[PDB]
Amino acid sequence: QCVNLTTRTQLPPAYTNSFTRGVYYPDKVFRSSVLHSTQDLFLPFFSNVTWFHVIKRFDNPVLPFNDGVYFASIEKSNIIRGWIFGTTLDSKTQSLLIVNNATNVVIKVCEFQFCNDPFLDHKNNKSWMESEFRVYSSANNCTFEYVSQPFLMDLEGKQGNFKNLREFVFKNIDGYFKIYSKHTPIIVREPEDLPQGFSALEPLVDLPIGINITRFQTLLASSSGWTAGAAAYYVGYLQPRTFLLKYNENGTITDAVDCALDPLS
Amino acid sequence: RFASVYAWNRKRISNCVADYSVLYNLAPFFTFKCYGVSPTKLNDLCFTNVYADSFVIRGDEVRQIAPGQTGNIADYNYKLPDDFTGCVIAWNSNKLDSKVSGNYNYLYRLFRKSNLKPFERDISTEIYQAGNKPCNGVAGFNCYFPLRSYSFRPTYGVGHQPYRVVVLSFELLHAPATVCGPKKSTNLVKNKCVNFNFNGLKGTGVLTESNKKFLPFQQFGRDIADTTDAVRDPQTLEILDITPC
Amino acid sequence: KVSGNYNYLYRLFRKSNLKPFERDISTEIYQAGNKPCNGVAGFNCYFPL
Amino acid sequence: DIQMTQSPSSLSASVGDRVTITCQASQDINIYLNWYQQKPGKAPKLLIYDASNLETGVPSRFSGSGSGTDFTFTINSLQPEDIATYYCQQYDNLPRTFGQGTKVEIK
Amino acid sequence: VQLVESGGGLVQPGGSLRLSCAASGIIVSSNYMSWVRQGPGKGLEWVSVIYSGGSTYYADSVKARFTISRDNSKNTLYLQMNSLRAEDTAVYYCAREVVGSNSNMDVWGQGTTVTVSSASTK
Ligand SMILES: *[C@@H]1O[C@H](CO)[C@@H](O[C@@H]2O[C@H](CO)[C@@H](O)[C@H](O)[C@H]2NC(C)=O)[C@H](O)[C@H]1NC(C)=O
Ligand SMILES: *[C@@H]1O[C@H](CO)[C@@H](O)[C@H](O)[C@H]1NC(C)=O
Ligand SMILES: *[C@@H]1O[C@H](CO)[C@@H](O)[C@H](O)[C@H]1NC(C)=O
Ligand SMILES: *[C@@H]1O[C@H](CO)[C@@H](O)[C@H](O)[C@H]1NC(C)=O
Ligand SMILES: *[C@@H]1O[C@H](CO)[C@@H](O)[C@H](O)[C@H]1NC(C)=O
Ligand SMILES: *[C@@H]1O[C@H](CO)[C@@H](O)[C@H](O)[C@H]1NC(C)=O
């Protein structure tokens, strides 16, 4: 259930110099008030995260998935409902489909034959609906099905004054897809500039998929085009690096430094 | 109701744990006649992709499930290899599946004229004609209908009564971890030195009580020596202690 | 033997370990389930050989 | 093994009168139990299937019933052309066994 | 549907021949039949029973004595005897199982009677 919409007024994505984001809990271990050093896959410090904006204007091309990614969204309406992962996405390579619908999340691992415009918007002018459920053409040789508790939801739609930020980190090692989630409320910065704050990333779940992955895609939610407002999201890519961590007395990370950035570092 | 002899019920039990203790308290004493694996070691020695067949035959053919014994049903409805692994569980159904007027829903096929290969289901709807004569009909001379009907009258003696039997067979097809779950739970915090295992952390020490606060995603505790000192019990959600001997 | 060689036996019902280098002749029927069997060839009363 | 014996060994006094032949089994038997009717030195001819079924053309005065390790058979027409010997046989219980002998004669 | 006797003759103990029951159209390879034993003045006895799958069942008194052959298309069943200790002074009947659960066949077959003794035909 897809149509070739096209006619998208795309722009090159902007770049925002990241300050502190790109850190997560490496394990499930209780250490209190001990400075601990480690090396693993993370987001390097002071690398510019790619800022995408969607207004009218819509854009969601295929993007590379190298050593896991870090996705963030600054919103208060929760337009993005799911994502698409895989390599070919044309009924040749086994692919992921993790979408949050109604009040649950569903994960579907199968041979997926998608369409040129994976869209869920497009029923009327502005009344939002999950139109075109079948983004894939047919159910091919399938692998895995999963249903669980949903993520955070935003009531109705809010355009402007985005007070919520959702940050997720995606990775896969040894065929294990680790997905971690975090949410920060009350963002009062109307004109860009990131935040310049520190927020540790709590783990969410790990899934043993055991399949290859090279690219990824995102999903958002009369018959052509929509009257939609402002939406903004961030995409960054990982690298094997090394950091320090300062656990507090309770077990929460409160400070972190890098080793391969500055001679002072 | 279980499926009949000609088409046994198919149920491929997979993706679970190992627990077969529900058979002992289900019913009074009944027949087990286990041959391959010892009956006391079913909880351990896990396998993969158990091949379960459920069907009801009278008591005459219950003991004919052993490999190497042929007959009328054991030769022409269900054939077993001599290196068979696993065993069956059989019990009477004198009050549940036995009709006072005689249950005739159960049917079996005896005319196949072919020795069965192990572990398959064959359907023979056609009628066999004898004497090299074209029958092309039902209920005629020298033509025999393979299907025949059971009778489950409760006034019958032992051997003619219905007997529910489920065939359980265990095979290692490269042994993936599909159905393998122990239990081994023992709650004993006696403040004495013990070889403890909590969620696979082998160690020896004296287990006492503490009050450390752990985050839900934060299970193990370490120290300066990078050794496990404070742990959390898997069945419950209590942080035990940092206490060696 | 193609005709049947049953002269070789083995034990599989002891519920007890062994030290090195001993033989044990337990002809008695092993009882499992903590219920006194006091019989021969009964349910949960298996011959050890 | 089924050990089966019958009291009416020699029914030589019956001339068109009531006959009460029977067979008893050592163990309890189902409905499946039949008889062979053979002349001395001749192959047997069937008359009873599954203790309740009858042939195509035979006299209809024959009757029988079997339940609880015992079958009873009664005949009232003692026609002269059916002077033979009646035997019992049980099946569906290996090994197969056969009767020891019943004598019927008309004067 | 008829059956044909084949056999006979008087032999000393230690000698045996082939007894045969021939069919009149019925296939004798992949079917269920049996042979039974009868003696003058005594009860019936069961020699053997053969199924389509090759299952041979017989009494323990005639253990390792009788071997049975089924023809593919000659419509004849053969039996060879072994270890004759002069206990086969009897007649054999070649027959079919009367009923499994519901049947109305009533056809049977004949056969020869054999006597075994140290004295031959006089
Ligand atoms: C395993 O789970 C079961 C429930 O699925 C537990 O049974 C009850 O659990 C509640 C909540 O934890 C307790 O308040 C009850 O006291 C439990 N009842 C019993 C009889 O145990 C069960 O306790 C759990 N296992 C363990 C070891 O805690
Ligand atoms: C959809 O439109 C794009 C844009 O030109 C084009 O490249 C593609 O071939 C079209 N696909 C179909 C199925 O029309
Ligand atoms: C963003 O990063 C890319 C490569 O990492 C670089 O080419 C580009 O100049 C950067 N832009 C800004 C504004 O830092
Ligand atoms: C959400 O999706 C799942 C499966 O994808 C479905 O079972 C559930 O009904 C959906 N919720 C709706 C349609 O409200
Ligand atoms: C295709 O299906 C078969 C089962 O028919 C399965 O074993 C195989 O893994 C599947 N291939 C995939 C998921 O790539
Ligand atoms: C640990 O948490 C408690 C309450 O959650 C707080 O009062 C305390 O200040 C925290 N410890 C530190 C070192 O901040």
Numbering used by the authors:
A (entry chain C): 14 to 68, 77 to 242, 249 to 292
B (entry chain A): 343 to 587
C (entry chain B): 441 to 489
D (entry chain I): 1 to 107
E (entry chain J): 2 to 123
What does the paper say about this structure?
To delineate the structural basis for 9A8-mediated broad neutralization, we characterized cryo-EM structures of a prefusion stabilized Omicron S trimer in complex with the 9A8 Fab fragment. 9A8 binds to the apical tip of RBD, partially overlapping with the receptor-binding motif (RBM). The 9A8 epitope includes only 7 residues, forming a relatively small patch, which largely overlaps with the binding region targeted by ACE2. Surprisingly, one mAb, 9A8, among the ten tested, showed high neutralizing activity against all VOCs and VOIs, with the IC50 being less than 0.1 μg/mL.
Similar to previous studies, 3D classification revealed that the complex adopts two distinct conformational states, corresponding to one up RBD and two down RBDs (state 1) and two up RBDs and one down RBD (state 2). We obtained asymmetric reconstructions at 3.4 Å and 3.6 Å resolution of the Omicron–9A8 complex in states 1 and 2, respectively.
